[PDB]
Structure formats: structure tokens, C-alpha cells
Design a binder for these strands. Structure first.
Ligand SMILES: [Ca+2]
Ligand SMILES: [Ca+2]
Ligand SMILES: [Ca+2]
Length: 424
DNA sequence: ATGATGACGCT
DNA sequence: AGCGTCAT
């Protein structure tokens, strides 16, 4: 019987990363309730990142700034840079590369988003294990680590108590014990996080466990600027009252149908179903994955990949701003094509690859899906005017309008994705 | 009128 | 190829 303790995997999360970037640049924003906003005009701007001081007053992501200031009147706002009429996230993409380069010195990392990376510590841990002459692990090597499920009046008091219980029972004589291995992973993640902070001023959270889903769950248990070790043995207690929708990839329609088809609420309850039963309800792939997951077993690998596989540029045109003339459809395409070329040229010189395919996506008024339609064409020159002309060429026939100069039904979204990279 | 992106599965 | 799901 396999237990999914082959690997040591971590998820590192830059807590409210865009806010940290702005608070490093503007010291007057540090240790204050504050948030980062996109587009000041409509209701003060849509909030895309919130410091923990502001989260205490109820300010959340996607809330309008004008509504946020009702919950939190002293809230400081930093504004996202705008280029060619759209939000430009270049400042944060650069900072994110800063952090992942430091992370790369410690283990192999998979960029999960601008602010999160998975980390495969298996080889790093094995190496570090030979280097420790069977020596004990000091609690002073784990100054921000929580041990989930432990211990069994002061918050710092609880943490150390749990950690001392953990360390006391540790079997340092067995170089293949998965609990010892997780502990060494956790010392390394402490080291990687002290270096990120030392070399960028950014703080981050982490979770350490045996796979990606446990690492991501562990990461969210103690935030901010804290890390959590979730061992294989903590899983049954942890899953016993864990809502299904908190497990990675179960927050959407699949999760809700697990809840509804099976009549359960919590991840642990999935253990009473056979793998064939789960496969018959959710399909061979989903059932196998579920069967193992509710037991803390998951095999999705940490892909060694710091660089995205698509480079894309989108802008929404909601409400009355939706595009309705051929003229303005062509101008935004041009605006979108131009920011895309800057990014592509920076990527050709920075990462020695060239993209070869161009995906144009649009969304129409009334349709409530992300994309209404997706068409592709070749990407031969990094030239904004060719790319916009070709993007337009590829979507023209969607215009059902009669008047030449008009576009119906209005476009609420324009999207240009460069993909199918190749070595250059 | 929760945006701008990104990864991936299915057919 | 083109659409759907899940996520930050
Ligand atoms: Ca928003
Ligand atoms: Ca944590
Ligand atoms: Ca899956």
C-alpha cells in the first residue's frame, strides 16, 4: 500500500503581492490598511489586492474602492500603471521574476501564478540529509513553522508547543522517514523565505507537505509570513472537517457535484466510496484522483518551469463601453497588439524563444462565458500592425451588422494570446 | 460593471 | 482546432 510520501513539495505564496510591491516603493503605505486598484473612474477602481490591515475591516478583492472606503475610511489606495488605455502589470511581473530567481537557488520551482510557486524539495532534502551527520533539528531552525494538528494562552506559545511535540517525537536516525524529510524541507523553506525577504523585502507564506494539494492547503492555514507543515498523519483529522471546495481543483463545478451527487460536505467523507464508485460518478480520471486525494495521495508533478507557455493581452469593455464600431474595434486591437509586441520582444531577448501562433479571443454582449469565440492564425513577425490587422481579419465575419462602419453585437472583450513558443 | 492572465482537459 | 474548467 502506497502512502504518497515519496516527495517533499511546498507552495510559496507572496501575501497580497501587488500591495507589498507598492509598499516597498512607497514607505508611507507600509503597515497601513491599503489596497491596489485598477481604473479609478468607475466607483473608485476595482480592488485587486488587499493588505491584511485592511482585510480586518472587511475589504476584499474585486470590491470597488468606493465601497471599500465605507468599510475602511483610512484606506490608502495605490493605482496600477496604465499604458495605451489598459492596466499594465509590468511592475509586478518584474518583481515576481525577482523572487522566483532567488527561489531557483534552493530547489526546482513551478511558477503557479504571478504570486505563487510550487517547489519540489525532494532532491534538496536528500542532499541536506547526508550533510547533517544524523544531528538533531533545533526548533531555532524553524522560527515561523506551525505543525498542523499539534499541540494535542499565547499564539506564539501554541506554535512552539506544537513544534516541540513534533521535534521530540522525530526519529532522526531514519534517513528515509517521511516525517523527518518534511521537517528538513521546512528548514529549507524557512531559509528560502529568509532570503526572499532579505534580498527583496517581500514576505511570504508557505505550506510544506508531500504533494501540491496538501502544500497549497497547508499554506492557507497560517497567514501571513508563516509556514505550515502538513504531515501524512495529520490528513484524517484535517480532512474530517475540511469543506470539499477548499481542495485545489474542487472549488468549481466538479466540487459542487461531488457534494450534491454524494451527499457529503467534507473531504474525509470521500474515503467511504470505492474507486469504481467514484469513477462511475465522475469519470475514470476524476474518480481515480478523488480516491487518492481524500487519503492525502496526489501525483501531479512539480513541473520545472519558471516561464509561461502563453503571453496574452486582454481588455474588458463592460456595460456601455462595449465596442460597436469597426473603427474602435481596430484601434483597441492595435493597442492590444502593441503592448503584446513589447512583451514578446522582451521575452525574445530575455528568454531566447520566439512565439509562433496568435490566438484572438472575443466576447459579445449578452454571452456570460469567459470567451465567446477563439480563432488562431500564424505569428511570423513581432509587428503590432500586422498582428492587429490579422487579428481583425480573423474575427471580421463575426460582425453581423449591416452598416459597414458599425459592429454588432457589441464586443465586451478583446484578447490576444501569443503561444506555441520555440527556441531562438 | 469583480480584471487581466494563465494552465490544462475534452473532443 | 475550438470550447470548457479552474485558478490568482
Ligand atoms: Ca476586480
Ligand atoms: Ca501557512
Ligand atoms: Ca483532476
Amino acid at each position: 500500500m502506497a502512502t504518497g510520501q515519496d516527495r517533499v513539495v511546498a507552495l510559496v505564496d507572496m501575501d497580497c503581492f501587488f500591495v507589498q510591491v507598492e509598499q516597498r516603493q512607497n514607505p508611507h503605505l507600509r503597515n497601513k490598511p491599503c489596497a491596489v486598484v485598477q481604473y479609478k473612474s468607475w466607483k473608485g477602481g476595482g480592488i485587486i489586492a488587499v493588505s491584511y490591515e485592511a482585510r480586518a475591516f472587511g475589504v476584499t478583492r474585486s470590491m470597488w474602492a468606493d465601497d471599500a472606503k465605507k468599510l475602511c475610511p483610512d484606506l490608502l489606495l495605490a493605482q496600477v500603471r496604465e499604458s495605451r488605455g489598459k492596466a499594465n502589470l509590468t511592475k509586478y511581473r518584474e518583481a515576481s521574476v525577482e523572487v522566483m530567481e532567488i527561489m531557483s537557488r534552493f530547489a526546482v520551482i513551478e511558477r503557479a501564478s504571478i504570486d505563487e510557486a510550487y517547489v519540489d524539495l525532494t532532491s534538496a532534502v536528500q542532499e541536506r540529509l547526508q550533510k547533517l551527520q544524523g544531528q538533531p533539528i533545533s526548533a531555532d531552525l524553524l522560527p515561523s513553522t506551525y505543525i498542523e494538528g499539534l499541540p494535542q494562552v499565547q499564539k506564539e506559545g501554541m506554535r512552539k508547543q506544537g513544534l516541540f511535540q513534533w521535534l521530540d517525537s522525530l526519529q532522526i536516525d531514519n534517513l528515509t522517514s517521511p516525517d523527518l524529510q518534511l521537517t528538513v524541507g521546512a528548514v529549507i523553506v524557512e531559509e528560502m523565505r529568509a532570503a526572499i525577504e532579505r534580498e527583496t523585502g517581500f514576505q511570504c507564506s508557505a505550506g510544506i507537505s508531500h504533494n501540491k494539494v496538501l502544500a497549497k492547503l497547508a499554506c492557507g492555514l497560517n497567514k501571513p509570513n508563516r509556514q505550515t507543515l502538513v504531515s501524512h498523519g495529520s490528513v484524517p483529522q484535517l480532512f474530517s472537517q475540511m469543506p470539499i471546495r477548499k481542495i485545489r481543483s474542487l472549488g468549481g463545478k466538479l466540487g459542487a457535484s461531488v457534494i450534491e451527487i454524494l451527499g457529503i460536505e467534507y473531504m474525509g467523507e470521500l474515503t467511504q466510496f470505492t474507486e469504481s464508485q467514484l469513477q462511475s460518478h465522475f469519470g475514470e480520471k476524476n474518480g481515480s484522483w478523488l480516491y487518492a486525494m481524500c487519503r492525502g495521495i496526489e501525483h501531479d508533478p512539480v513541473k520545472p518551469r519558471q516561464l509561461p507557455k502563453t503571453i496574452g493581452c486582454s481588455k474588458n469593455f463592460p456595460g456601455k463601453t462595449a465596442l460597436a464600431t469597426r473603427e474602435q474595434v481596430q484601434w483597441w486591437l492595435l493597442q492590444l497588439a502593441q503592448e503584446l509586441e513589447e512583451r514578446l520582444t522582451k521575452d525574445r531577448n530575455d528568454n531566447d524563444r520566439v512565439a509562433t501562433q496568435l490566438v484572438v479571443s472575443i466576447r459579445v454582449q449578452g454571452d456570460k462565458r469567459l470567451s465567446s469565440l477563439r480563432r488562431c492564425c500564424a505569428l511570423t513577425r513581432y509587428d503590432a500592425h500586422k498582428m492587429s490587422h490579422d487579428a481583425f481579419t480573423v474575427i471580421k465575419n463575426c460582425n453581423t451588422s449591416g452598416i459597414q462602419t458599425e459592429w454588432s453585437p457589441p464586443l465586451t472583450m478583446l484578447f490576444l494570446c501569443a503561444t506555441k513558443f520555440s527556441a531562438s
